[PDB]
Amino acid sequence: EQESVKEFLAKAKEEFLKKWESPSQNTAQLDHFDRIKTLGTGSFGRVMLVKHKETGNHYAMKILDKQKVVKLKQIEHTLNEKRILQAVNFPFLVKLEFSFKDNSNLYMVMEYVPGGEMFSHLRRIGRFSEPHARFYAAQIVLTFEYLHSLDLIYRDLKPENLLIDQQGYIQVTDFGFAKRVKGRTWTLCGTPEYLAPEIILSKGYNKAVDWWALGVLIYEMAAGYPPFFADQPIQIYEKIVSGKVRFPSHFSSDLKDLLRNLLQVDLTKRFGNLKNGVNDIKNHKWFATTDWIAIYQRKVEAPFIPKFKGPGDTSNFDDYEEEEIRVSINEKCGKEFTEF
Numbered sequence: 001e002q003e004s005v006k007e008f009l010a011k012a013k014e015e016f017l018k019k020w021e022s023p024s025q026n027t028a029q030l031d032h033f034d035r036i037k038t039l040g041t042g043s044f045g046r047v048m049l050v051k052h053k054e055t056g057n058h059y060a061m062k063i064l065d066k067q068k069v070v071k072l073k074q075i076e077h078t079l080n081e082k083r084i085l086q087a088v089n090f091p092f093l094v095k096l097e098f099s100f101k102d103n104s105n106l107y108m109v110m111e112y113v114p115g116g117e118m119f120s121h122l123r124r125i126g127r128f129s130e131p132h133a134r135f136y137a138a139q140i141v142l143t144f145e146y147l148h149s150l151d152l153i154y155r156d157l158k159p160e161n162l163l164i165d166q167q168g169y170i171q172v173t174d175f176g177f178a179k180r181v182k183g184r185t186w187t188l189c190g191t192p193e194y195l196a197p198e199i200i201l202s203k204g205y206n207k208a209v210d211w212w213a214l215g216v217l218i219y220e221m222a223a224g225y226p227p228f229f230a231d232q233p234i235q236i237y238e239k240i241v242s243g244k245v246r247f248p249s250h251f252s253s254d255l256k257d258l259l260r261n262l263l264q265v266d267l268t269k270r271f272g273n274l275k276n277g278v279n280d281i282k283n284h285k286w287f288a289t290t291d292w293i294a295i296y297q298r299k300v301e302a303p304f305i306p307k308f309k310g311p312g313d314t315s316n317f318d319d320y321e322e323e324e325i326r327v328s329i330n331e332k333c334g335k336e337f338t339e340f
């Protein structure tokens, strides 16, 4: 590790810790924004495109229903998400610009990235070439190097959680499962196709699960489909734990070798979790053409630039039923979300 990387990560940790210890709170309110379009929706929350009425800036506003968060046992996860997001700073992480709460909801107002989810682009083109997949993978490697050095585990890597920005670079979203962890953690969370074996088997697990997920992501980017798939989760899990993966013949030998080391069932042998840490990945032959510093500095020409007309264009996102943002006249779940 060049002292330059050590000193970068030491300063990164100092800056993170200062914000972690003293989190920002209550930095805007709902009526500062106009609602434009629902960009995504789930069992306890939504992401909305909004426009700030005074500056005209567009943002992606994540709205979480406090009662549903409680019911689906997401309290600590939502507190993790906001506390981490307000404390991190890296070129490939979506920035949290404001947060606040009201009687009914929690709000995280993030940068809006108009290029859409990697998932859409991957499905439209079919599969990415190895250089294209490598460009995105390198950004994830650097982002995980950053996060893991802060004792953070991300726990939701997948194409739907990676947005393509105006320059063609990655912006990681969706910190709902991210957690500050020294050692092990135990919660069953993630997305089935991306779960490491040790999550499936209810073990105490660590940052190695993020490196496993990177193997899944790289396979999916280069093949067009993930390595372990089936009609039901239990059948996916049987495949994940088996230690067997098949590679398309069009994969390069270097790609197959990297993937066997990321998709290593034995977490004590998995790249990213050995004595040399991230450098086993950064020094692998599949990354020989990668200029890590140039990627970090965003000096590499991207494989493609999403097509969009301006900062408010939603054409790269899909259409959802537009529901109200209702705020109760009575405070709900105040105690549970005191720190938010």
Ligand SMILES: [NH3+]C[C@H](O)c1ccc(O)c(O)c1
Residues within 6 Å of the ligand: 039, 040, 047, 059, 060, 094, 110, 111, 112, 113, 117, 160, 161, 162, 163, 173, 174
């Ligand atoms: N999974 C992506 C998520 O819905 C989303 C969409 C647009 C954004 O700018 C964002 O920060 C998050």
